[PDB]
């Protein structure tokens, strides 16, 4: 028995089904308890700190001073962006939640009247607080205690500390408008990667769409709030030239503002106004 | 219970089914309202500007002057072409429409008498205008306001502005025939990538066929109208050596002409004459 | 409701089913009309010229003279072989036909008495003539008119013309036996990639098996007749040191001979003698 | 007959199903006999030693002294991390078990009262002992007897021994807290890769999720107990500057402690407390 | 009609099903006739010679003397290992058989009493002889006659011959124990790649698992008997410094011994003793 024409399948969907899946995934978040949501947020912040530690080491390897005289920072930023996007798989496969992707899904669930306003506020607040706690706890308990980013003062050995120092100094000397714009550019890629895993239901789609999206915002110099929380806190721990005021006021607050603006307004409102009738037709056919 | 011979599947189709899917996807566009189509076009232009900002930064990293003395522009153009093709996934997963892919699908729907001429004209006009608006709005509100491409005048720091300046000067000193030929070569790859996502219905097919196609036209020096709108407008904003007349007359108008010629004539008419009887047999079996 | 053991699938087949699919795909070609087959052949030659233009530009970028003093031609040939294999996807997704893959499938359909001899001759002749016409038409109307491979005489700018010149001079100074052997080595990879897309029915199989096969013959220095038609004609257009006699007699005729020998004899006759009883059992079970 | 809308599939699952699959896979381990479990553990340790030999050779190739003066150790560590992750596929496709992944699955099966404490202890002990035996047996019978890492004393030829020596000296001069932190960071990636293969049921998911995870911990400098057993034993065999006391007390014992802490506590307890009600609902619906 | 939860699939299997598939695939080989098996073995040896020619050219490109002064042999061996693993797809998609993978499957079919001893001996003998004949016939009729590896005596042009000469001299100066150990390390990867294609039934699994496995043994310096037959015979043809006695006694005989030992004993006996009861339960449920 020979097979000539096998069964035709597909693992992709259209934009209407992807919007409906996004609204359903966003409205499922408001039904968990506070401790379940908090533990998920802490785990996701810890995974972000894990992959950003691995990225800092992989980038600081290519920040060797003789190579840095020839190529500058190009290979270090490329290898950082190459090895960072596994954090998306770490978060999605454990079922945890991060604030940056929530700014689209839970907000569009709020637009479709699936989540009330107080439930929306507590979901976003618990998500941001738990992501912060997981990021700083990985920054101290693994990254600081392993001594990987310690200043060792010799130029042929200090490329890990020098890469962390130069990255932390670069992302702390923007103005307010510049940091808001870079954070907007980051969270558009992040929410699009959430749309990618809601659309493409295979392992190849999951791995490589979010690989190219997360690598793309990483090499662009765009600003991610949870990654910046980890990076600026481990920079403050190992005594980089930045200040606590510089890290929290000059980077973290406009990064939070720009990430929320890109999630809730730049992407959430146009997609809601494009696809709300399809969610209406989906909800009427279930009655 | 052990499985020795699993169920045989396929996620690909033939050329006849791919043509029929292209005509159906093209004729669905003329049934949306004007504001739905306009919002989709603005979102697609914004995504093009997003990924082209990320590509300009990733390419300008490898345009460092000591590396530029050794390798020229090769690594910068390669890294640009590597990080650009995620815009296709950004456009297809949100259900938005871009003019360059529309020049094949809506035109072959017009050839098969599925779209009237006035509907075809308003679909193409609204698509081009919305793509323009989204591209210039990302060029100003993110790219210009973040200061990423500002001339900083020091040769060890100015590689982002110098890469944008050299790219903008290169794509503005073609003659008319040269720019039309390069735009034809671009839109053939673009419409083939649209055929790829109409044929290969997995995440791997979606990601990597359009990766290789879009990278291929990006490294070839071929001219894309929406990408050129973003690039020449952000070049005009940060005071590159190009002129407004040079950008709009010497590049953008022959790029528009060559892109439409490749979409509607070079690819649309041969595929229509090859496969119109299969669309006839498909439409007769639905009666 | 939780899923622990999902449905077991497969997207691959055995050698018997792959042979039967090859004979069926080969015998479908003799039932198209002459103009349908001619338009498909012209489109496939045009796609080959498209991807070979993109490969020549991508390779000539890494043929920069300061990099060429250090690495030679290695990175240019690697980047050429990296960016060439998208032509296979361009040909298969539009349903067009190229002569090199036809030398296996239509010949094994002739061995199984599915195609008569005159039908076989007109299919192969129309395929070769249309592939030639599409290749030279892309060489003139896009590649020559865009000025991408023009001799500009300055050594820091002339790397595109110099790469085309050195490639065209290398593939024109073989003897007859050497060119026949390299063409045999090329068409074995080409017909194996046709077997790969007949066996592996996903997007990942389609993209990456023919990626590794086509990259493998491209970096090996093996000779492809349609790619050589494009390359030697664009080399003759931009006034490379080669002669018309050298291009047509010293390369193109032994490349045609070696490609047909590898398709019809080296691969077609052993696979026919191995698997003809399985095609007999397949054809008897349909009665 | 044309197919326009194929059958929609998925090869991924949610976090609840992934937790349930993890608990089931962990509780299946306590039902094998002692010799079956011992042979599986010996095979897995042998596969780890195989892929780490291949990684040491691939890394020592790029540790050539003239390249080492320019780039340092960056390309060697990158090529090591590139070629190491095939060990995961070697272990999963033969059905063998490694201690590092067991510290999550069997421990969460113990938390859900599926495994008794004495059965848990003998499973973990037999796993660790067999993994040790397989690693040292590959270190002697293949790696030492092939002479690949012998000190040959000439600086242009000694890059394999020098890479093994520098790696072994680097991972033996940590303090206790540093080694525990790096081992925690390793086993979080390892247990996440186990979650990846429990979630993504295709070949692409299997290959590339664990590729990016295992490459990520390899380039980060994180400490894996079985890989360190192989590496420090082959370093002791070929007379690297390290001591037996240094290898066993300064690296192997805190690596074992940190790997068990990351598997059982950092990842097992939060996932258990998040998802134990879903395992309760799964187990009640089977009655 | 919108799809929210598609049908859950999987393309992977467990270790028991993979063992059963291996025993069935191994016992199918003893039912072919002698000429069918001989033609399959000759085709597989020819494919090995094809991909090893392409690998020798791709590696000798990066063996350019100015690059060789900086990086040594690292990039040449990496590019060789990158472009070699397409031979596995060439062999599996045509249904042919190679000796190295047969040493596991046919031997475990012999352990399960599915193949008699004389049938086992003639299958292994015909496989080895046909693989030899195909390898030497490709070495002469394509590789030698194309002149690609001819000594041209000028150091800026002789990198192909110099790469072949240095590889052939390296793999001929091992002792007996060293060559046996390296051959064992090779055939473990080869038989694991056979297990990979028996387990992962997609195109992505087929391409990339055997890509990473075959690249891993290629960059490790492990010894493959059929690849060494091709390489040492083309080295003897183009007058490399090696001798016929050195090639056949110092490399080929211990490579054959180590490959058979790794296939039949190191991997076949533990997997047989682990999984023979599952094959018993599979065979009893078919009665
Ligand atoms: C559906 O499961 C998920 C998975 C990922 C995210 C997410 O937010 C990811 C990022 O933000 C990120 F990609 F930038 C990084 F991981 F790097 F931090 C999420 O919100 C939900
Ligand atoms: C079916 O959904 C789509 C997706 C993409 C396009 C498209 O046109 C894409 C480009 O033009 C592009 F690839 F060049 C880039 F994205 F880079 F701009 C489209 O028309 C329709
Ligand atoms: C089944 O659809 C196809 C697809 C491709 C070919 C083919 O022949 C391809 C080449 O020859 C090639 F790979 F070398 C290149 F594309 F580069 F030219 C074919 O014959 C039929
Ligand atoms: C389900 O089958 C498996 C597969 C792999 C592991 C495992 O533990 C793997 C590692 O630890 C590793 F990735 F670090 C390396 F392989 F490199 F050693 C396991 O526990 C169970
Ligand atoms: C099931 O179909 C197959 C496919 C491949 C092999 C095989 O043996 C492959 C190698 O040995 C190899 F990977 F090393 C190379 F191909 F490179 F030679 C086999 O035995 C059977």
PDB file of N, CA and C in Angstrom, chain E residues 192-218:
ATOM      1  N   UNK E 192      23.418   6.875  16.019  1.00  0.00           N
ATOM      2  CA  UNK E 192      22.467   7.760  16.678  1.00  0.00           C
ATOM      3  C   UNK E 192      21.682   8.593  15.671  1.00  0.00           C
ATOM      4  N   UNK E 193      22.307   8.993  14.560  1.00  0.00           N
ATOM      5  CA  UNK E 193      21.570   9.715  13.522  1.00  0.00           C
ATOM      6  C   UNK E 193      20.549   8.817  12.829  1.00  0.00           C
ATOM      7  N   UNK E 194      20.874   7.527  12.692  1.00  0.00           N
ATOM      8  CA  UNK E 194      19.893   6.551  12.211  1.00  0.00           C
ATOM      9  C   UNK E 194      18.716   6.441  13.185  1.00  0.00           C
ATOM     10  N   UNK E 195      19.006   6.420  14.491  1.00  0.00           N
ATOM     11  CA  UNK E 195      17.947   6.484  15.503  1.00  0.00           C
ATOM     12  C   UNK E 195      17.138   7.780  15.429  1.00  0.00           C
ATOM     13  N   UNK E 196      17.790   8.892  15.076  1.00  0.00           N
ATOM     14  CA  UNK E 196      17.096  10.175  14.962  1.00  0.00           C
ATOM     15  C   UNK E 196      16.080  10.151  13.830  1.00  0.00           C
ATOM     16  N   UNK E 197      16.463   9.612  12.669  1.00  0.00           N
ATOM     17  CA  UNK E 197      15.495   9.577  11.571  1.00  0.00           C
ATOM     18  C   UNK E 197      14.459   8.482  11.790  1.00  0.00           C
ATOM     19  N   UNK E 198      14.752   7.495  12.636  1.00  0.00           N
ATOM     20  CA  UNK E 198      13.705   6.543  12.991  1.00  0.00           C
ATOM     21  C   UNK E 198      12.730   7.121  14.012  1.00  0.00           C
ATOM     22  N   UNK E 199      13.142   8.143  14.764  1.00  0.00           N
ATOM     23  CA  UNK E 199      12.287   8.724  15.794  1.00  0.00           C
ATOM     24  C   UNK E 199      11.509   9.947  15.307  1.00  0.00           C
ATOM     25  N   UNK E 200      12.192  10.917  14.706  1.00  0.00           N
ATOM     26  CA  UNK E 200      11.593  12.207  14.373  1.00  0.00           C
ATOM     27  C   UNK E 200      11.136  12.194  12.918  1.00  0.00           C
ATOM     28  N   UNK E 201       9.828  12.091  12.706  1.00  0.00           N
ATOM     29  CA  UNK E 201       9.262  11.903  11.369  1.00  0.00           C
ATOM     30  C   UNK E 201       8.765  13.218  10.765  1.00  0.00           C
ATOM     31  N   UNK E 202       9.632  14.226  10.713  1.00  0.00           N
ATOM     32  CA  UNK E 202       9.341  15.404   9.909  1.00  0.00           C
ATOM     33  C   UNK E 202      10.575  15.738   9.091  1.00  0.00           C
ATOM     34  N   UNK E 203      10.430  16.740   8.226  1.00  0.00           N
ATOM     35  CA  UNK E 203      11.570  17.213   7.462  1.00  0.00           C
ATOM     36  C   UNK E 203      12.570  17.967   8.315  1.00  0.00           C
ATOM     37  N   UNK E 204      12.088  18.699   9.318  1.00  0.00           N
ATOM     38  CA  UNK E 204      12.986  19.430  10.207  1.00  0.00           C
ATOM     39  C   UNK E 204      13.814  18.489  11.065  1.00  0.00           C
ATOM     40  N   UNK E 205      13.174  17.454  11.616  1.00  0.00           N
ATOM     41  CA  UNK E 205      13.907  16.448  12.365  1.00  0.00           C
ATOM     42  C   UNK E 205      14.932  15.733  11.511  1.00  0.00           C
ATOM     43  N   UNK E 206      14.507  15.271  10.319  1.00  0.00           N
ATOM     44  CA  UNK E 206      15.400  14.607   9.368  1.00  0.00           C
ATOM     45  C   UNK E 206      16.597  15.467   9.004  1.00  0.00           C
ATOM     46  N   UNK E 207      16.368  16.739   8.678  1.00  0.00           N
ATOM     47  CA  UNK E 207      17.467  17.586   8.230  1.00  0.00           C
ATOM     48  C   UNK E 207      18.399  17.915   9.392  1.00  0.00           C
ATOM     49  N   UNK E 208      17.855  18.432  10.494  1.00  0.00           N
ATOM     50  CA  UNK E 208      18.715  19.094  11.459  1.00  0.00           C
ATOM     51  C   UNK E 208      19.273  18.189  12.549  1.00  0.00           C
ATOM     52  N   UNK E 209      18.608  17.078  12.908  1.00  0.00           N
ATOM     53  CA  UNK E 209      19.231  16.161  13.857  1.00  0.00           C
ATOM     54  C   UNK E 209      20.455  15.496  13.245  1.00  0.00           C
ATOM     55  N   UNK E 210      20.337  15.048  11.993  1.00  0.00           N
ATOM     56  CA  UNK E 210      21.484  14.403  11.377  1.00  0.00           C
ATOM     57  C   UNK E 210      22.487  15.445  10.918  1.00  0.00           C
ATOM     58  N   UNK E 211      22.055  16.702  10.711  1.00  0.00           N
ATOM     59  CA  UNK E 211      23.014  17.776  10.475  1.00  0.00           C
ATOM     60  C   UNK E 211      23.936  17.947  11.669  1.00  0.00           C
ATOM     61  N   UNK E 212      23.357  18.077  12.866  1.00  0.00           N
ATOM     62  CA  UNK E 212      24.179  18.310  14.046  1.00  0.00           C
ATOM     63  C   UNK E 212      25.006  17.080  14.409  1.00  0.00           C
ATOM     64  N   UNK E 213      24.467  15.873  14.195  1.00  0.00           N
ATOM     65  CA  UNK E 213      25.226  14.656  14.494  1.00  0.00           C
ATOM     66  C   UNK E 213      26.401  14.457  13.533  1.00  0.00           C
ATOM     67  N   UNK E 214      26.166  14.628  12.226  1.00  0.00           N
ATOM     68  CA  UNK E 214      27.211  14.356  11.249  1.00  0.00           C
ATOM     69  C   UNK E 214      28.256  15.466  11.260  1.00  0.00           C
ATOM     70  N   UNK E 215      27.821  16.723  11.432  1.00  0.00           N
ATOM     71  CA  UNK E 215      28.753  17.820  11.659  1.00  0.00           C
ATOM     72  C   UNK E 215      29.583  17.592  12.920  1.00  0.00           C
ATOM     73  N   UNK E 216      28.964  17.030  13.966  1.00  0.00           N
ATOM     74  CA  UNK E 216      29.663  16.801  15.223  1.00  0.00           C
ATOM     75  C   UNK E 216      30.765  15.763  15.074  1.00  0.00           C
ATOM     76  N   UNK E 217      30.512  14.668  14.344  1.00  0.00           N
ATOM     77  CA  UNK E 217      31.615  13.716  14.183  1.00  0.00           C
ATOM     78  C   UNK E 217      32.631  14.219  13.161  1.00  0.00           C
ATOM     79  N   UNK E 218      32.208  15.073  12.224  1.00  0.00           N
ATOM     80  CA  UNK E 218      33.138  15.570  11.216  1.00  0.00           C
ATOM     81  C   UNK E 218      34.137  16.554  11.817  1.00  0.00           C
TER      82      UNK E 218
END
